[PDB]
Design a protein around this ligand. Structure first.
Ligand SMILES: Nc1ncnc2c1ncn2[C@@H]1O[C@H](C[C@@H](N)CC[C@H](N)C(=O)O)[C@@H](O)[C@H]1O
Ligand SMILES: Nc1ncnc2c1ncn2[C@@H]1O[C@H](C[C@@H](N)CC[C@H](N)C(=O)O)[C@@H](O)[C@H]1O
Ligand SMILES: NCCC(=O)N[C@@H](Cc1c[nH]cn1)C(=O)O
Ligand SMILES: NCCC(=O)N[C@@H](Cc1c[nH]cn1)C(=O)O
Ligand SMILES: [Ca+2]
Ligand SMILES: [Ca+2]
Lengths: 340, 351
């Protein structure tokens, strides 16, 4: 039963990838119908408006071809997908920017470089054979952070639950070599807050780096499924690196429990992120929202020793740099050690 | 005669929403407690202050409800609203509860010392342009007519009136009108009131105390307008109220033109009602309030298109600055913040 319900969920996501163009063409048709409803004197003020909609339509069609390339390369009547899933699909396109485009570099350096520096600090070659250091990256997203860690020689495993992320990371990590071969239009659905009409249809390219350039003897892998269910072996991991991850929990205390169980004595958990609880005030969903002060008190009561704590680490997440409206986070970075 | 009744129906709908705040917020907190109480007992024992913290939030909810009932009491007994009448007790919608939460945050932006930094980024650039174009050496400020559409809680219109200009604020939303009538007419003592504008945010809290911290208002006495000043506020749609052409020396729009169903209609109204030689000062982003909503018209223009439309009307561009950084009802202690790269422009209707 559970295995087939997963197959039902599997096809539900395949269908969403295939419904992208339909969903976006309908949104552009709404904008076009409203423009044509305007008095002719106002339409005449904007002689490029309908042409610009045609450029958006071309970008939609291109994005849809990328999405089909992803869906085809992970297999070997399109029914209307839901609004929840089309939003997750739009976020997935933006994820290619953060994880695999030059455009996403400044974001990666704010989020990933502090984690990588702490791994290098705690697992130096003077003390460890890196190939024997087992590092787990739960909620690895499109896999760039786990990839960076494996590029250093550590045995790194990323884990991911979302098929949106697994289909896409499978494509980038296994069907991509040629730097910047591919092109996406990730901002075409934002019609607000554009300085210039061109900003909305601008492309991004990926991958900025060759994913098949892992060193000889690298140990990189990716698992599919609920982090809290896949990882049952206690005292297994040297290091767990969570990035924008622990606020995805129905109950973050369970995440902390799992991380404690599966770390080796002496192992470390590195965390960087905010506390945007993903199930907060969502209909009929468990969500325990803790302040950072409460999370620290749970961590201390568990027995972790605090080795690093920085608050107010500024970063963005899939930010559109040209947008007239932007979000940023004052993340917390901490490194805690399971006592040996 | 049908507007007379759909407006009345809307008025009591907003009153009822103000009265429903406590019920709504208390339900949210009761959901939090129920979910906490269903965790394993050993996890509950890791947080021995959690239930007491919910109790502090519940006290903040009651205090907020008291402020909202004071606003209600003030506007029900306002002579101007006798046309609205005096038998249903419906629960309010989620949309209106969201508008109530935004309304509490506006008090921070417009009438609290906590909001001073935000005001100085949005309101000072507008005010400097007014002083620049109607300097005291050459203009009797009391004969300069300045319209502030979408005035919200009114702080900007008030600041302009404080300088001596004949300033009128305009606002459509009953949430803003009820609250601004209360602040501008009844809050005559600095920092006498407080409210708890952040208690609804359970995410991105550094310390639990941050969620329940108060803000005080008003930071200035709104009745410290000097003798000779000329300050007023109108109720209703900017496009329907102002139909006389060639009336205003200056129109000042702050975080406003992106509320339009069709921003071209706003631009057209502004051009008609300015005196020849008058100026339109604008500062804000382009967050179109009706974008992608079923059965709502929304024309989303890039800033480039807005400037092109403005130029085609015959406005002359005198000031243009992009990337004017500002926040909007920002929670300074939150771990997640939004900001805007606004455009400031000053355009002149040719004489
Ligand atoms: N229980 C879970 N097990 C595995 N993955 C999860 C789980 N919960 C959430 N996720 C994924 O965690 C990721 C959270 C992302 N915000 C972060 C992605 C990535 N770490 C990044 O910084 O870009 C999402 O991709 C989720 O699909
Ligand atoms: N057609 C309209 N006529 C009058 N007021 C409007 C209209 N459309 C939107 N508003 C109000 O414009 C205001 C927009 C606010 N974002 C800005 C308020 C204020 N200018 C501030 O900067 O704090 C809201 O209070 C709206 O209720
Ligand atoms: N302005 C962009 C903000 C954004 O996309 N946050 C994401 C990712 C996130 C935030 N905390 C943990 N994961 C989301 O909402 O899921
Ligand atoms: N980060 C807080 C954001 C916020 O409240 N923005 C207002 C802003 C706005 C933009 N133009 C007119 N008003 C809204 O969405 O109504
Ligand atoms: Ca109690
Ligand atoms: Ca007084």
């Amino acid at each position: 039963e559970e295995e087939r319900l997963e197959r039902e969920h599997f096809w539900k996501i395949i269908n969403a990838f295939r419904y992208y163009g339909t969903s976006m063409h309908e949104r552009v048709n709404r904008t076009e119908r409203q423009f044509r409803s305007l008095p002719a004197n106002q339409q005449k003020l904007l002689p490029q408006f309908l042409l610009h909609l045609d450029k958006i339509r071309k970008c939609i069609d291109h994005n849809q071809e990328i999405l089909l390339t992803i869906v085809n390369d992970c297999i070997h009547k399109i029914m209307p997908a839901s609004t929840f899933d089309m939003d997750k699909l739009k976020s997935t396109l933006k994820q290619f920017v953060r994880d695999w485009s030059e455009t996403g570099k400044a974001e990666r350096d704010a989020c990933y470089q502090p984690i990588i520096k702490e791994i290098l600090k705690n697992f130096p070659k003077e003390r460890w054979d890196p190939s024997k250091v087992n590092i787990l990256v739960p909620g690895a997203g499109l896999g760039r952070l786990a990839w960076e860690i494996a590029m250093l020689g550590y045995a790194c495993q990323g884990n991911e639950w979302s098929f949106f992320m697994l289909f896409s990371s499978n494509f980038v990590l296994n069907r991509c070599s040629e730097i910047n071969k591919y092109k996406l239009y990730p901002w075409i659905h934002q019609f607000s807050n554009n300085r210039r009409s061109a900003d909305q249809i601008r492309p991004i390219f990926f991958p900025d780096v060759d994913p098949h350039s892992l060193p000889p003897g690298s140990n990189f892998s990716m698992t599919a499924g609920d982090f809290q269910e896949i990882y049952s072996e206690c005292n297994t991991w040297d290091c767990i690196a969570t990035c924008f991850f622990i606020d995805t929990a129905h109950n973050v205390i369970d995440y902390i429990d799992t991380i404690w169980k599966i770390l080796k004595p002496g192992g470390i958990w590195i965390n960087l992120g905010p506390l945007l609880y993903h199930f907060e005030n969502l209909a009929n969903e468990l969500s325990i929202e803790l302040s950072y002060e409460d999370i620290k008190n749970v961590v201390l009561q568990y027995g972790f020793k605090v080795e690093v704590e920085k608050e107010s680490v500024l970063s963005t997440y899939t930010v559109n740099d040209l947008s007239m409206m932007k979000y940023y986070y004052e993340c917390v970075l901490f490194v805690v050690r399971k006592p040996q």
